[PDB]
Write a protein that binds this ligand. Sequence first.
Ligand SMILES: [Cl-]
Ligand SMILES: [Cl-]
Ligand SMILES: [Cl-]
Ligand SMILES: [Cl-]
Ligand SMILES: [Mn+2]
Ligand SMILES: [Mn+2]
Ligand SMILES: [Mn+2]
Ligand SMILES: [Mn+2]
Ligand SMILES: [Mn+2]
Ligand SMILES: [Mn+2]
Ligand SMILES: [Mn+2]
Ligand SMILES: [Mn+2]
Lengths: 81, 84, 98, 97, 94, 93, 105, 104
Amino acid sequence: LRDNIQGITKPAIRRLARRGGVKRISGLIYEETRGVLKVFLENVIRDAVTYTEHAKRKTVTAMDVVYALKRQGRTLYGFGG
Amino acid sequence: RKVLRDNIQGITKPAIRRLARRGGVKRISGLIYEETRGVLKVFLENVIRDAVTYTEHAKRKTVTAMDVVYALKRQGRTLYGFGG
Amino acid sequence: PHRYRPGTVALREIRRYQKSTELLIRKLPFQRLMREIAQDFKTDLRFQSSAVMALQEACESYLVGLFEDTNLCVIHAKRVTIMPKDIQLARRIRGERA
Amino acid sequence: PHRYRPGTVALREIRRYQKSTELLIRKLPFQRLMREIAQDFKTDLRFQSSAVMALQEACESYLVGLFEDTNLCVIHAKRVTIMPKDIQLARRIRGER
Amino acid sequence: RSRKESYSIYVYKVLKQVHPDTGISSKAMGIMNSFVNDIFERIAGEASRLAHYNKRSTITSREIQTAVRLLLPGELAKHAVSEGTKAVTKYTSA
Amino acid sequence: SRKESYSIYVYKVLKQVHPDTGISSKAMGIMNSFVNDIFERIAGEASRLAHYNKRSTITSREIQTAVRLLLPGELAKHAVSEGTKAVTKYTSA
Amino acid sequence: AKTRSSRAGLQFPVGRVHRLLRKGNYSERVGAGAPVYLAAVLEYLTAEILELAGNAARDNKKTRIIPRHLQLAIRNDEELNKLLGRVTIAQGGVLPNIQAVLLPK
Amino acid sequence: KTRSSRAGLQFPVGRVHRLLRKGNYSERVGAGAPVYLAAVLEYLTAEILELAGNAARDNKKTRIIPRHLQLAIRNDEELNKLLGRVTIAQGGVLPNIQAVLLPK
DNA sequence: TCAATATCCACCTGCAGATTCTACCAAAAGTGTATTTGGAAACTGCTCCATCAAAAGGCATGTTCAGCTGAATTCAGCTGAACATGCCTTTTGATGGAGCAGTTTCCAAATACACTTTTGGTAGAATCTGCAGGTGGATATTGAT
DNA sequence: ATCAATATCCACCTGCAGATTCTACCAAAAGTGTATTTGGAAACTGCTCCATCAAAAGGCATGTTCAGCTGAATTCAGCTGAACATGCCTTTTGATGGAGCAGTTTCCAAATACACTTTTGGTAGAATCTGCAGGTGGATATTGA
Ligand SMILES: [Cl-]
Ligand SMILES: [Cl-]
Ligand SMILES: [Cl-]
Ligand SMILES: [Cl-]
Ligand SMILES: [Mn+2]
Ligand SMILES: [Mn+2]
Ligand SMILES: [Mn+2]
Ligand SMILES: [Mn+2]
Ligand SMILES: [Mn+2]
Ligand SMILES: [Mn+2]
Ligand SMILES: [Mn+2]
Ligand SMILES: [Mn+2]
């Protein structure tokens, strides 16, 4: 048992921060990070699935994600554009 | 006619103070004034450059307000109010 | 004589300028700055009057918006006096120099 | 009975993770979260393998970036420990708020 | 003669519908025209992309609808989508 | 049919600047995304440029102003150089 | 001879929106419902902001909407503010807002 | 006899042309536009490959991978600015530790 | 410094997984024509920009002066790092079964055309008015005592 | 714990710079009758994608300790705000010449449209190759003393 977002663990969040140059992490950053990560995924996924639904498909494609990302101003290279 | 020089000093301390106010700033360090002018010039140059590029491309010698609007649109700063 | 304590007129000015919408940089001086900068990029350029106004509007909206962000840094740094260091943090996070 | 001083390993991980490029969030947990969120927009969705991969890449690139801007605030507040208010300041000046 | 089109008379009609008593300064109308033109370009722009991403050479009311869902936030989207659909079904009723 | 990419062209250009160097497929995917992106940005701006000036055709002149507006300083000069060079060469022999 | 707008039950010009679509290089062909649907959304959005601007006018004892009124209406509406988050309203000013920490104790 | 060999390019002038026309950008497309655009695309491609090729070499590697394209780009001011809003999958970040975080 | 941990760092080493290299077909790309236009060129009507003159007073510039804010220091409370433990959730590697992108192949509905009428809109005149700017007291809002 | 000193507010007023209306065209919607497609709609396939297993293997979750970071309290030196005296320079109003948009028309050079003819780029196999990951054995970088 346990929540899915809680699946995104402390050590993992630590690792991300570390690649970000962060030397010390307050204990409150973990719940804060999951919330941000959740708002990010919601916005991207919502857009991707909207491209999916428009193409009348049932399968979210990398392109749908790339276009969602492009609209959120987060252009991604490596997946078809 | 005459030579244009040092006009960035025309953006006075009181004008910068008013801008900071509308921006909600309560206290201003003495060095803020030269930074602001610096930041303003970079912003202006960039917008002037693109605007003038739209002008030049249209084979005109007169920068229109649309040129400026398109310049800003390029920099992700959409402007409402001078569209026609 | 009578003297308002430092900060009182400052707050008075914030309420005043946030209440109004007029341009805060004098007209002519701004027009010279635009002409000087324009001139250094391309000579013999002419400007529609509204083109000058569009630039001033954009420049002031930009500076004002930058001062709010800068004001958030100051307060976050547990200070109240904006410093170049703060404008820099803001432009940095904004991605004007990320 | 050797023990490293607090911060020495922290710096070491920074050097390690800034050198590597692997995804830092475990895949399955992520996949789980993604599908859960996606499930609220349209049910019974399937996902291209690369779609999940594209998604995770974007998220981690966003969090690492957001952690950089948050660190700039901490060093700005003459601190060294990131706090929620620091992430909150960064997201605000970024326009996400 | 040089005649330039604008969304002014339409903006004005809508204004009278929502606030019969209220008027608008031309500087404010200027802003409204910029807004209508901005949203139009955003919608059309997205609709164009949507259409391209699906090898479709034509933009139907369905493209405009997905574009609106992608561009507008929450309620604004739902009310727009409702008005859009409502206007189209009525239009197709001859 | 199927999926046409810029792969072979990126590769040819690779061998030109680094004959001894190869490129991972994931890296080829990056280059493709890169060319499609730059292509769209330039064509998009050129499109805008022609519309602003009530033109119905995108000429090398639009592609150029677009490049001027999109590429930073020195990258623009060289691009404008290569660009005009290819068109000059194309027009002659 | 009925205008497409009346058939659509709209104030905004359906015929004009259609033309703008064809002449905007958005796609090879434009469906008949496309301009109708877009003219409607446009009209809905300008109605939503004129409604709130009119309120701002009213609140400020003015009967004529001006830019500041449009700004107050945009920035006080979470959604329009989001929609126009990168837009600058010439002559609109800012929302009056002084951070708490700055006021006297 | 193809337009690319005539234009002296590796990049496909014929494809760039077909892509412009069918891309809904304009009613008509000039003959030189695709040549020019193609030249601009090939040039930027060479620029990145050059810097990334170097990045590979400086790593005792002969095959360019994402990490390399990433270091080439972020370590180059103009490319960096041009791709400032782009995230290179699997590219990671430039190693960089704020002085205030180091000991001594 | 001296010493004992652990960390990094080279220099090799040998497959396993990608890469690179090969051998062949539809589908673009190049031709050769026959028509169309797009939009430059050559005048020219005529807005709209750059300039200049003048006067007025709104504001920018400097200065003095001292309130209180930012920068230093010091202190200790307790938060978050480093670790050794113990455990299970993620990784992965086949195996299928099958949900479903992608095609195909009609074509009926929906669009684009080419031309002709028919208004709805736009560009100024002619009118109609919020409200900008002013003034006076009524109301606070501050800051010294 | 009031009171001067100012700043802020509201209401009442009234001409005019700036909206609303009012007319007259004509650019461009609307109406029609053909000549095209577009893109669904069933029917089918091979992919890819979930599910299921089924173990091991890291990688995570825990509980301790305590180093050292952050927040609190105090100081105080000096910057920056408030208030003045001055008088400069922007703002306001008007008047002009003419630089240069913008509108027309005239019309080739260049782009579009087939109808074909060839060539190239995308695939699905075939034949290497680059490092990844592992092994030492050698100085480093740390941290305790
Ligand atoms: Cl500073
Ligand atoms: Cl916090
Ligand atoms: Cl439709
Ligand atoms: Cl051309
Ligand atoms: Mn109403
Ligand atoms: Mn013509
Ligand atoms: Mn203090
Ligand atoms: Mn202690
Ligand atoms: Mn009529
Ligand atoms: Mn008043
Ligand atoms: Mn071939
Ligand atoms: Mn190795």
